[PDB]
Structure 1
C-alpha cells in the first residue's frame, strides 16, 4: 500500500476549495473553487490527460467554499462566501434552488444520508437546517459556537441521529439531530478549527485546524479517543471509504494514518512557499484520492503496492 501522483486536473483559475465524488458516476467528479465555479470533470484516464472539464457551474457571486453530490449523483449542493447555498441539476448544469437565510459567508454544506435534509455552517456563527426546497427549518444560535462555524457534517449512523460541527471557538460540537439540541462539547484544541469528518460507521469523528493535531472522538460514547500529530495546519480531513485510514491535508502535504497502529502509512508531497492542500476526496472505488491546491490544480493520487 503506497500512493503515487497519477495526474492533475487543470481548469480552475482560483484555489480549489473542495472536491466531491459519486459512486453512480465514477468518471465524473466535482470541484469547488475561489474562481466562483464548480467544475464537473470527465475522467478520461489517458497518456495526455487524467480528466478534462466537462461543464462549469456558474451562479455564486463569490468563492465557492464547499460542494457535495446527492446519493443518485444527479444533483450537487454548494455553499459560498456570498452567503447562500445552491442546488444544481447536474444534467442541465443549472441552479434549481437558492438557499437564502445566512447573514454572512457560508463555509460548509452537507446532505443527510436520505438526502431529505441539508445543513450549513456560516461566518454568522449559526448552523442552519433546511429542506430540499430552500426553506430554513431550524437555526441553531444558542448553545452554538461563539465564533465562525467552519464545518458541519451528518453522521451515517441512524441509531444515533447526529450532526457534528467545529468552529473558530476551538470547539467540536455534537448535536442531537431530532431536537437540534447540544449533545456534547469536545474541548481540547488550542487553535481554530477548519474541518470535521465522520467515519463510514459513524463511530469516529476527526477534527482539525490551526493547532495541527487531528483529534479522534468517539460519537457513540461521547469521549476523546486519541490525537495524531499533523505537524502543520490541518485544512481538510476524510476517512478512506474502503480502508481503516485517516487522511489530513496538513499544510502542503497529505498525511495518511493507519488507525490500527496509529502510524503514518504515507505522506504525499509535491517534490518561496509550496502550494497548500485545501481539500481531499476519495473516488467511488477508494483507489484514487483527489486533492485540491492553492495553485488552482487538482492532484490525482493513486493507490499502488
Structure 2
C-alpha cells in the first residue's frame, strides 16, 4: 500500500552498532550499543541537517558491547559486552551503578524483567545466569543447558507466564520457567545457528531467526511450530511491532517487514545511494528495534550508522 523512507542517519560511532534499545518514556532519545567501547544515548532533534545528535557516551566496557536494554522507567540502562561482565548505567548522570561479574567468556545477550527486578544474561560459556539489581547470581543453568553459545534472550511481557526464551548456536530455541529455573520445552526444527529471538508484545508467540534465513514462529501457550517465513539472506535481528501486526527482520543488507495475517512482504528497505556496485559487499543490517509508538524503526548496520525508517502513508 506504501513505502518507508529515511528521515536521516545518526553518526557518532567508530565501531558498528550491535544493539539498539528503545524506551516508551522518552521519545526524543534512543540508546544504541556499538562494536567500539561506547554506548551512545542519542538526542532526536528532527532537524533538516541532523535527525539525531549524540548526547551521552556510556564508556566503561573493556571490549565490544553486544547487547544494551533500557529500564521501563528510563532511569537505568543494562548493557552486556564481550569483556564477560554486565553494566547497569545511571542513564541520567552516565556512570555505572552496579557492575555484574560471574560469566567466564563473552556476554552476548542480556534482558530485564517488565518490572525491572529480574536480569537474564546469555554468554559464550554455555550458560544463562539470573541476576538481581544488587549483583547476586541467584541461579545458573548447567546440567540440561545449550550445547553452544546463547546468542539472544528475551522475556514474556505476559506476567501470567513466568517464561523466558533463549536461542543458541546449538540450533535449538529453549523455553525456561522463571520460578523453578529449569526448561518448560525445547524447540527443534531450525537448521543453522540462531542469531536472534524476539518475543511478541502479547507474550503469546516468538520468532527465531538465524543462519538458515527461515524466521520460524513459536507459540508460548502451547510450544508448536506455527509457520516459517523465508528471509532470503542470513537473519541477524528480529523485532515485532508494538502496536501494529508486523514482524521485522534484518536480512543481510535489507530490512524485510512482513504482515502476520497475509504471509507477504510489506517492504524491503535498502540503501538508495549505492556505493557497493563493483566487487564490494553492502554494509549488512545487524540490529534494529521499533520506536515507542510503533511509527519509527531504528536500525544499526555494519557501516557504524543508525538509519531511521518512519511510516509515510
Q: TM-score range by the shorter chain?
A: over 0.9
Deviation by residue 1:38-94 (Cα, 9 ceiling, x = unmatched)? 001000001100010001000000000000000111110000000011000011100
CA–CA distance in structure 2, aligned partners of residues 152 and 141 of structure 1? 16
- Structure 1 residue runs of 4 or more that deviate by more than 2 Å after TM superposition: none
The whole-number CA distance in structure 1 between the counterparts of 2:183 and 2:291 is: 33
Cα displacement (A) at 1:32:
0.3
> Following TM superposition, by how much is the alpha carbon of 1:221 offset from its aligned partner in structure 2, in angstroms?
0.9
SS state of the match for residue 170, structure 2? coil
In the TM superposition, what whole-angstrom CA distance separates every residue of 1:244-277 from its partner, at most 9, and x where no partner exists? Answer: 0000000010110100011111111113001010
The answer to whether the aligner puts 1:281 opposite 2:289 as a matched pair is yes
Query: How far apart are residue 135 of structure 1 and its match?
Result: 1.1
TM-score w.r.t. structure 1 length? Answer: 0.99
| Structure 1 residue matching 2:6: 3-state secondary structure | strand
Give the stretch that moved more between structures: 134-143 or 232-241. 134-143
Q: Which stretch of structure 1 is more off in the superposition, 134-143 or 286-295? A: 134-143
Structure-2 separation of matches of 1:244 and 1:286? 10
Q: Distance in 2 between matches of 1:241 and 1:216?
A: 17
In the other structure, the counterpart of 1:178 is 179
User: Unmatched 5+ residue regions in structure 1?
Assistant: none
- Aligned pairs for 1:209-288 (under 5 A) are 209-271=210-272, 272-288=280-296
User: SS of the counterpart of 1:98?
Assistant: strand
- CA distance in 2 between counterparts of 1:4 and 1:143 reads 46
Shift of 1:284: 1.1
- Count of aligned pairs: 305
Decide which moves more: 152-161 or 32-41: 152-161
Match of 2:158, SS state, is coil
Shift of 1:36: 1.1
- Cα-to-partner distance string for 1:106-131 (whole Å, 9 max, x where unaligned): 00010011110000000001001000
What whole-Å deviation, never above 9, does each CA across 1:214-265 have from its counterpart, x for those lacking one? 0001010111100000011110000001110000000010110100011111
Q: Distance in 2 between matches of 1:19 and 1:285?
A: 16
CA distance, structure 1, for counterparts of residue 215 and residue 143 of structure 2: 27
Superposed displacement of residue 2, structure 1: 3.0
RMSD: 0.7
SS in 2 for 1:4: coil
Q: What is residue 56 of structure 2 aligned with on the other side?
A: 55
In 2, the alpha carbon distance for the partners of 1:158 and 1:53 equals 35
Q: Which runs of 5+ in 2 are unaligned?
A: 273-279
Partner secondary structure for residue 268 of structure 2: strand
Higher strand share: 1
In the aligned structure 2, how far is the partner of 1:84 from the partner of 1:174? 24
TM-score after normalising by structure 2 = 0.96
Deviation at 1:24, TM superposition (A): 1.1
- Aligned to 1:134, the other structure's residue is in SS state coil
What is the SS of the residue equivalent to 1:16? coil
CA shift for structure 1 position 139? 0.5
> How many angstroms apart in 2 are the aligned matches of 1:170 and 1:107?
16
